[PDB]
Design a protein around this ligand. Structure first.
Ligand SMILES: *Cc1c(COP(=O)(O)O)cnc(C)c1O
Ligand SMILES: *Cc1c(COP(=O)(O)O)cnc(C)c1O
Ligand SMILES: O=C(O)CCC(=O)C(=O)O
Ligand SMILES: O=C(O)CCC(=O)C(=O)O
Lengths: 404, 404
């Protein structure tokens, strides 16, 4: 810096901000020939480019002034209306909720932090959870309580235990943040009974639930779950959806659905952070949903990713040594691996990279960074054939790591 | 709200957020046939829709995967490169600065607040200043020092006086925020001597200057000023530009240029608020600048707005009673009017609306809401002929207000 101790200008929060060492390494790995299973991106082969092209022409012919001008903070009305119609028909989400357009669900999470969190307020997350949600919330200084998952998602029973123990300390949780379907990073889905149990606790202990659902349409097997938001009679759930994996992430459009009191506050908070979400992408998304193209395209995304999931699950079963375990997602973009004998997968990544494969070490996904034997693998954006070869390389890395 | 008192969940900052009731009234005024001089929007007749259409075609042919995928937090590299080439050639901004793409300069202002401001840190603003900048910064709880403007922009003399008084109290300012060319709302421009004088203060008193410049290309008369950032030898200036009025606001793309140490921190802060600025709009903006289209389009914007500024200035001279004063902008979107005899323009707005004209009361533009006899008029987006009629109605409103 020219200033040169530029830190003398920084806020207390800025002084605690740091770039991820791991994320920097992984940026590098992506530009090389290593087989990376570390990505979190959807595959551009799933972007509906011809429908997008037709929609762009349509906008310049018919909607140019609306797409080009500033928008309201709350969002482009036709997109808000078409999304609530979609959500009600498809999922049985109630129309008495309100809806705000966001600049991605990342912006929803930042705004949830601004609107709800005072320093020291308690947020419950799953262990593991979505690392960007921890990043969003961390700016607001919450305390976290972590609730492990199993193959049926959040162990809501341990959440009841922890809520009782907090209550005995005179304390309460303010927000439970859940990614309950095809989790990033775990790949598992909260079952129906647990969704209902979470909501009874939400009532009994008076907290807000944030349900982040980027992947529910990327279902490859099994039957659709009920959204927590569709079971929400009290209006305690804030539901987040996004176009990132069902259209493309390049337009940075998502939506937040919830109690109108909560939405109204979110709108005022948003106004000062970005004025409005880009209206041009909102008009594109509106034509995409309202024109029926989202509905028609969803099966093409599923057809593309399913065999990639299945190839990875096949390779793990054939190559992984005993004592390695992994989740079996019915949808989404990730499979989550648990390593035996105390291997530290952060320490192992150096060995894996040397053997030609990368993954994201699981530690980063725990609020308390306190579990070390887990890894996130992605199947959406490796070259297919490279899924088999990448899983072999990782299996051999684990074999050698296991040798003292 | 379904939750009963939903306020029980809100953070301390959320509890202080309120919708502007002036802004609510003016929303309604816009949908009626009152002549509104209250807008802050550029005119869609200036949007380069043909060029945009060609650019969209080009992107789907050649750049679709980049435009549709997630981007890096820092921004789309070709856009960052083309902007720095543009800013160096056009303005002499130095290439040792770094650049980050933002989701509008509104997002730049929020991020400046996040990165620099602890509660109680002192921010200097002009009096008046841009209301949304006050909104962005208010979340971070600064103390403001207001420095009045004259027809040559900020009275930097008074800033030196206030910096010496604060120093005597053992205090310092952290940031001076300036809109030094065709100010929103005042329409005036800081002269060259004062730009140099501000930077001497910034060195002597050790503060950062944020230069927000959305309008410098919308110059209708006179000669181009030197950007503060072009005089900035010490790397103390963070320069904000935006495509809102030179392309169209619908893509919500801006940029922030400054010391690489400050930009690096800004990138980490932004990552948690929105992951990245919409890449699709950044590819559009890149073709727009790199293809020469921006440079070709700017004279078309100037040709459009100039006669509207001139009609409004003619109408004010012909119609306004003695003792009314207004600024004489060489550019931008606004004229700023000062009323005599202690008229309160917020109180007068009810009378103006009854007579068929609206404007924005000046009070909202003062950090300390302490001046009551000013108004912001916009000439960019009234249907022109209505500029003369609007100014006449406002002149008659002021004459009636001056009576008992
Ligand atoms: C993919 C992902 C998102 C997407 O966020 P956007 O900002 O909308 O792109 C949000 N939450 C989780 C858990 C994700 O995995
Ligand atoms: C027009 C305007 C802006 C524009 O902000 P964006 O978020 O880029 O649209 C910023 N600052 C001022 C002073 C303005 O008048
Ligand atoms: O690469 C990106 O910008 C997406 C990163 C991501 O999906 C996340 O960390 O939330
Ligand atoms: O109407 C808009 O969103 C633009 C408002 C604006 O420019 C502002 O308040 O800063």
């Amino acid at each position: 810096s020219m200033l040169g101790d530029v830190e003398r200008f920084f806020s207390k929060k800025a002084l605690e901000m740091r770039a991820s060492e791991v994320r920097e390494l992984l940026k590098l790995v992506e530009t090389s020939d290593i087989i990376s299973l570390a990505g979190g991106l959807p595959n551009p082969k799933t972007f509906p480019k011809e429908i997008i092209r037709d929609i762009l022409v349509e906008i310049m012919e018919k909607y140019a002034d609306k797409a080009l001008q500033y928008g309201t903070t709350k969002g482009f009305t036709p997109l808000r209306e078409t999304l609530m119609k979609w959500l009600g028909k498809r999922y049985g989400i109630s129309q008495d909720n309100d809806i705000m357009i966001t600049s991605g669900s990342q912006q929803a999470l930042d705004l949830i932090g601004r609107v709800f969190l005072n320093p020291g307020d308690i947020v419950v997350v799953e262990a593991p959870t979505y690392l960007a949600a921890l990043q969003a919330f961390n700016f607001y200084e919450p305390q976290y309580i972590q609730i492990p998952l199993d193959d049926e998602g959040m162990k809501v029973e341990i959440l009841e235990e922890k809520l009782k123990e907090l209550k005995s300390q005179g304390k309460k949780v303010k927000v439970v943040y859940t990614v309950p379907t095809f989790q990033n990073p775990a790949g598992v889905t909260m079952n129906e009974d647990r969704r209902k149990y979470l909501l009874e606790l939400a009532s009994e202990y008076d907290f807000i639930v944030v349900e982040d659902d980027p992947y529910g349409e990327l279902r490859y097997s099994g039957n659709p779950e009920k959204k927590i938001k569709a079971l929400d009679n009290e209006g305690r759930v804030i539901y987040l959806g996004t176009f990132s994996k069902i259209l493309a992430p390049g337009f940075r459009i998502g939506w937040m659905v919830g109690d109108p009191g909560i939405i109204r506050k979110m709108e005022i908070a948003k106004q000062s952070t970005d004025l409005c979400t880009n209206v041009f992408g909102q008009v594109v998304a509106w034509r995409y949903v309202d024109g029926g193209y989202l509905e028609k395209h969803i099966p093409e995304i599923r057809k593309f990713y399913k065999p990639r999931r299945d190839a990875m699950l096949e390779a793990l079963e054939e190559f992984m040594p005993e004592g390695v375990k992994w989740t079996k997602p019915e949808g989404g973009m990730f499979i989550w691996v648990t390593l035996p004998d105390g291997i530290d997968s952060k320490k192992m990544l150096e060995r894996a990279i040397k053997k030609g494969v990368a993954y994201v070490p699981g530690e980063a996904f725990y609020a308390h960074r306190d579990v070390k034997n887990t890894m996130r693998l992605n199947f959406t954006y490796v070259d297919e054939d490279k899924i088999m070869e990448g899983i072999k390389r990782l299996a051999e890395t684990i074999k050698e790591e296991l040798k003292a």
